[PDB]
Design a protein around this ligand. Structure first.
Ligand SMILES: C[C@H](CCC(=O)NCCC[N+](C)(C)C[C@H](O)CS(=O)(=O)O)[C@H]1CC[C@H]2[C@@H]3[C@H](O)C[C@@H]4C[C@H](O)CC[C@]4(C)[C@H]3C[C@H](O)[C@]12C
Ligand SMILES: C[C@H](CCC(=O)NCCC[N+](C)(C)C[C@H](O)CS(=O)(=O)O)[C@H]1CC[C@H]2[C@@H]3[C@H](O)C[C@@H]4C[C@H](O)CC[C@]4(C)[C@H]3C[C@H](O)[C@]12C
Ligand code: 118
Ligand code: 118
Lengths: 268, 268
């Protein structure tokens, strides 16, 4: 049986048989020496059936080679099974994210706020945890901290890139009684003089949105991130962070400012 | 911000930014014309945020290069959603098949049979449906009936490959007096003669199991397929076929006879 007849018996392409002969998965029963013509046999079909049976389970080709040439490989079927359930979990996550994306696109004609899930590494910060009378007043006590720390900690170099964020320890929304905590990432440890203390913040997987524009429409992004959290079955594991990437310090226009809100979450 | 600092901001590889600038998505703000250095801005951070948000949803990159500038394209999200739904339903199918595979290596010391789905196209066959008392007389009675057909039908030529098979139109287990229907695919219509008629047998999806060995143990393959159909959440749609690939016509030793059982099946 030539390769054209075998490809019609097997209902597979000829190039598939060429590839399987090249890699050594399915070798023809007899190859004509002068022409090169591959000839196949029923005993090759009995093996192509096994190849197809394994390949329909999503096994990679090299896994199929290992399974059919070397027996007692029950660890490879377990690896493929665990990977299949992991991919199923990831696929359910992706499905929820794309359903949410369509309900939002069908909600507002322009999408102002995309949501991205990113992992934040561990870091060394100096932090001051304090009760703030108003969000407008929160901005006032930060530049005092910025000069005082550089005067009190000489040669202290902030990391690059600059991770300067806020920990919202409030489990509910309020305007005037915010128990907030100002953090700023630094390269190495230091002295803990004053109300400013040093600490490490654990690496977290967090869903983040970057808000461009003034600080009054941030409630939109928070409700959106909360909406994302309720829609996609995540649970808030830690306090939300507020990372100030660009602001009045690089650019004078207040509507081009940008900050990224991070929601530490786990899928539950 | 040079490509290294920006790549540290986004926690992404420099090769990713190089590739992106190559394909046109996320071109940097300023390309130094002297040395080719790529400099980035926070506006590229905002473009990359949504790039990564779509990439985390499964969209291919060439889908992203249309999705992020032709913002009104909305069919590509329900399209990606239906595509992911098809992939998840297949992954869940594969998961049931691998757990079943594992159960079978627990049940039997050897994976003697290996099931595999295949699509059997529609075909014009000559068919004779009747009741037979046993297997020995049925096996003996087939070849004279074939000589009768191939002689009495001038111009009738067999199909390449040679698909000769049987259907079992019973509903309960009959070891004897089995309402069997023999068919053999022909390239074109011949005229009916007596109890043998011609018809076109519809294209089906079927699970298949090859049995290399004597004929008195093909019932085991059916048992395996029945367990496979009941376990893996499948349903027998039509009468189970049995295709004769190799037999008394090509080889004289019974221990190397290879026959393939086909169960027309659909998933629940
Ligand atoms: C969902 C979240 C708890 C979890 C609640 C509890 C504390 C709330 C923030 C603070 O009020 C400060 C600030 C007020 C602005 O008005 C809107 C933005 C800010 C960041 C609020 C957003 C959001 O509503 C927070 C994080
Ligand atoms: C499990 C299955 C039920 C399906 C519903 C039972 C019911 C009818 C049974 C077949 C017939 O008996 C004919 C034939 C007899 C041979 O001896 C063994 C093969 C055949 C094809 C049998 C296989 C199997 O045993 C069948 C499909
Ligand atoms: C210590 C030192 C600098 C800043 Sb800032 C800032 C950030 C958020 C809200 C208000 C101010 C800063 C600068 C670069 C990168 C990230 C943050 C700052 C610097 C100069 C002038 C005004 C403000 C804060 C603490
Ligand atoms: C018409 C009907 C049946 C057979 Sb065959 C057979 C031949 C070639 C390829 C496939 C099948 C047969 C039997 C004895 C001698 C010569 C040919 C046949 C036998 C048993 C069961 C099914 C088919 C041949 C023509």
């Amino acid at each position: 049986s030539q390769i054209g007849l075998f490809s019609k018996i097997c209902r597979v392409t000829i190039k598939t048989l060429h590839y399987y002969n090249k890699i050594g998965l399915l070798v023809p029963a007899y190859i004509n020496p002068d022409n090169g013509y591959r000839f196949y046999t029923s005993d090759q079909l009995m093996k192509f059936h096994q190849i197809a049976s394994l390949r329909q389970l999503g096994f990679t080709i090299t896994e199929i080679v290992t399974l059919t040439q070397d027996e007692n490989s029950c660890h490879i079927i377990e690896r493929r099974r665990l990977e299949i359930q992991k991919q199923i979990r990831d696929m359910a996550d992706m499905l929820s994210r794309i359903n949410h994306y369509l309900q939002h696109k069908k909600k507002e004609r322009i999408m102002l706020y995309q949501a991205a899930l990113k992992e934040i590494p561990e870091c060394i910060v100096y932090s001051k945890r304090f009760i703030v009378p108003d969000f407008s007043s929160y901005i006032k006590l930060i530049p005092p901290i910025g000069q005082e720390v550089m005067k009190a900690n000489p040669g202290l170099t902030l990391t690059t890139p600059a991770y300067c964020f806020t920990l919202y320890h409030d489990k509910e929304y309020k305007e005037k009684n915010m128990d907030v905590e100002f953090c700023e990432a630094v390269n190495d440890f230091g002295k803990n003089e004053g109300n400013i203390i040093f600490q490490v913040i654990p690496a977290i997987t967090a869903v983040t949105v970057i808000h461009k524009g003034p600080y009054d429409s941030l409630r939109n992004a928070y409700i959106y991130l909360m909406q994302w959290v309720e829609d996609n079955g995540y649970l808030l594991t830690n306090s939300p962070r507020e990372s100030y990437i660009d602001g009045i310090w690089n650019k004078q226009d207040s509507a081009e400012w940008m900050t990224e809100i991070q929601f530490p979450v786990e899928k539950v």
